[PDB]
Design a protein around this ligand. Structure first.
Ligand SMILES: *Cc1cc2c(cc1C)nc1c(=O)[nH]c(=O)nc-1n2C[C@H](O)[C@H](O)[C@H](O)COP(=O)(O)OP(=O)(O)OC[C@H]1O[C@@H](n2cnc3c(N)ncnc32)[C@H](O)[C@@H]1O
Length: 426
């Protein structure tokens, strides 16, 4: 019957990204033999097109079991702890609608699962006493929640640290044409390996597809996942300017955008807040009988001259003019699109393929899974071994026809890059 952990060969497709690197880590921590694990990625770990290849991501206070288990590891696991910056978060709102919603969010913590960590800031001057770097004339009528819990995650560094640990263990890697998945290798309905674009054939007992936004492009997912991009750009502070924002909280206003503490090189990343962009084109995933119109990521790693739409730049410039008016003349550089894939309900897609035995999906990240990096591979290993909790097996199940992922649980259906000029410089 089935091999032991030490004798099981596993291929992790997308193992240079978030879910895939975590899966490879948890296979080695679980006592799989490192040389029996093969990481395949289009790009070397940390993949240059991974959504986790970022200077920073937010760590919030999500009460979910996966998020809580990840939070404990960001605080306690020596591989990850140094990459969690506990700056806290300043969530601001203005206008009657946004303030009323913020006030209810705050009350839902008092009423329910404790505040302790959280403060209501009921005026401009209370926001300024927390964050003196803001400008009063730009925050007229604002209120905020200040949370001391959470902060930001040094995302690319964390995936790089997993990759170094995996290399030092003796995990096997294939990248570029030797890593770019083309198709599963099927033998009478059982997946026994993968073929890459260069024609290399890798054989294993189990295959994990952790290909992020590329997952519905690579195999037929029946629109369960729809891929979308979000945007950012960067500004460079002088050492004196950057020292003002040492340990600064993540600052967010849902009408405006958000920005992070400068990194150790003085760079602040600034983001819009919006429902994402698709990039529909004709493509034929493995298991599709003909080409289909699907959202296919427009990869900045493949197209490094790409930037972001003009509309996005206007929004990011508005966010800088509002949060950091003293920096409005700094150029916005290293502008990029970053891709995720939404399910209709925003829950993960972590399941065995219904026809291809031993081929597992680990995707549906839905734009909020970087914080799960330390833990998510544990659940994927449980899935491979048949021990995943039944409630999670159901929540993460194969579910075509379960709702429109174009809108997902977001405010609107995503707009398409074909309609949003300014990002293509070919
Ligand atoms: C884009 C984005 C995401 C994001 C965010 C802001 C932006 C702009 N803010 C976040 C935040 O504050 N907090 C948080 O927890 N998450 C946030 N996110 C979302 C997060 O980045 C994603 O949910 C998560 O990183 C997705 O992980 P996943 O593992 O699913 O995807 P990935 O890291 O992109 O990795 C996919 C890998 O697949 C490889 N690939 C693609 N095609 C192939 C082929 N053909 N063969 C082999 N490998 C392939 C990619 O190269 C990549 O490494």
């Amino acid at each position: 019957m089935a091999p032991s952990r030490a004798n099981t060969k596993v291929i992790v497709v997308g193992g240079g990204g978030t879910i895939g690197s975590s899966t490879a880590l948890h296979l080695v921590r679980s006592g799989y033999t490192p040389s029996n694990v093969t990481v395949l990625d289009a790009y070397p770990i940390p993949s240059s097109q991974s959504a986790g290849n970022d200077l920073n991501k937010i760590m919030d206070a999500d009460a979910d079991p996966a998020a809580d288990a990840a939070r404990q590891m960001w605080n306690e696991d020596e591989l990850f702890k140094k990459f969690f910056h506990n700056t806290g978060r300043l969530d601001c709102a203005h206008g009657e609608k946004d303030i009323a919603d913020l006030k209810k969010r705050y009350q839902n913590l008092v009423d329910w699962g404790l505040d302790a960590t959280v403060e209501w800031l009921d005026s401009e001057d209370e926001i300024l006493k927390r964050m003196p770097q803001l400008t009063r004339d730009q925050i007229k009528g604002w209120k905020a929640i200040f949370s001391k819990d959470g902060g930001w995650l040094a995302a690319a560094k964390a995936i790089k640290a997993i990759g170094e640990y995996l290399r030092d263990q003796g995990v096997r890697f294939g990248f570029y044409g030797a890593g770019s998945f083309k198709q599963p290798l099927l033998a009478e309905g059982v997946c026994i390996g993968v073929e890459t674009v260069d024609g290399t054939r890798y054989y294993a007992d189990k295959v994990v597809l952790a290909a992020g936004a590329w997952s519905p492009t690579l195999v037929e997912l029946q629109e369960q996942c729809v891929s979308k991009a979000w945007v950012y750009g960067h500004i460079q502070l002088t050492p004196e300017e950057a020292a003002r924002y040492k340990n600064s909280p993540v600052v967010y206003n849902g009408d405006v955008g958000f920005f992070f503490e400068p990194n150790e090189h003085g760079i602040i990343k600034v983001c819009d807040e919006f429902p994402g962009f698709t990039r529909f084109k004709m493509h034929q995933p493995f298991g599709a009988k003909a080409p289909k119109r699907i959202s296919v990521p427009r990869s900045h790693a493949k197209h490094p001259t790409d930037t972001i739409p003009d509309a996005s730049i206007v929004r990011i410039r508005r966010a800088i003019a509002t949060f950091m008016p003293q920096f409005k003349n700094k150029p916005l550089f290293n502008q990029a699109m970053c891709w995720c894939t939404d399910t209709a309900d925003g829950h993960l897609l972590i399941c065995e393929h219904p026809e291809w035995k031993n081929f597992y999906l680990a995707t549906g990240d839905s734009g909020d899974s970087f914080k799960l990096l330390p833990i998510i591979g544990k659940y994927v290993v449980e899935l491979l071994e048949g021990t995943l909790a039944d409630e999670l097996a159901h929540k993460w199940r194969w579910r075509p026809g379960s709702g429109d992922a174009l809108k997902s649980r977001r405010e609107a259906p995503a707009k398409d890059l074909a309609d949003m000029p300014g990002w293509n410089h070919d």
